[PDB]
């Protein structure tokens, strides 16, 4: 039932999922007066060499690139829990115009889109057991701003034409997610939640300081997707983002000065 419409969007989710009003919900605004530099934070490193992409899918509220997460060398490492996190999936959230679309904000600034690279902490065995733990997932969040094109994004935005409607799936092998990363891996981190139902508070959020630049042509391709299935009335897939939630007692930590 849940979606991003007026009558089933973020403001409605709490009715089915009471945790929507919990103590560790995401996304949040990152106020740069209040993030505390933490010299103990382990810097991020990626081993995406053997990351093995499988397929890309339109599930009716986003598109997901699925990975073979049995590749034990394809991991994100570091962060507050010094974790080793298996890459399993990535997806985006975006807006109906360039001035909005991101889920996290920085000093209340919204970006055009946000990329979420989803990983599960290997010490919990599989993604299913991981989402039961407060630090079970590491989601690497990366802001998208409009400017020059991102060459590593081209394979992603171009295949979207093949999965325009809900339910469409396409083989998507040999995609290298290193092509989606900015130069710097300086980051903010805080304990939070999935930003869609079931809104489980199982995420160590790692949000990169540096946005990637993508072209207007690239972002437009996001907005050609459909929420609806083939033959149904056309509803363009836009504004599939949850707004910032109460920070409550949490401290946002910065890896950088
Ligand atoms: C249904 C349930 C629990 O929700 C999510 C989910 C993940 C990330 C986000 S988000 N937007 O990044 O916070 C929101 C939701 C997954 C999931 C998806 C891909 C890989 C994985 F290991 C788990 C689930 O299995
Ligand atoms: Zn997401």
UniProtKB/Swiss-Prot annotation:
Keywords: Acetylation, Cell membrane, Cytoplasm, Disease variant, Lyase, Membrane, Metal-binding, Osteopetrosis, Phosphoprotein, Zinc. Its EC number is 4.2.1.1, 4.2.1.69. The active site is at 61 (proton donor/acceptor). Changing residue 103 to D: Normal CO(2) hydrase activity. One of its GO terms (cellular component) is apical part of cell. Optimum pH is 6-8. Changing residue 61 to W: Impaired activity, rescued by 4-methylimidazole (4-MI). Impaired activity, not rescued by 4-methylimidazole (4-MI). Target of drugs used in treatments against glaucoma disorder and breast cancer. Changing residue 61 to G: Impaired activity, not rescued by 4-methylimidazole (4-MI). The modification Phosphoserine is found at residues 162, 169. Changing residue 62 to S: 2-fold decrease in enzyme efficiency, as determined by kcat/KM ratio, and efficiently inhibited by chlorzolamide. Zn(2+) binds at residues 91, 93, 116. Its cofactor is Zn(2+); Co(2+). Changing residue 59 to D: Strongly reduced activity. Changing residue 59 to H: Reduced proton transfer. This is Carbonic anhydrase 2. The gene is CA2.
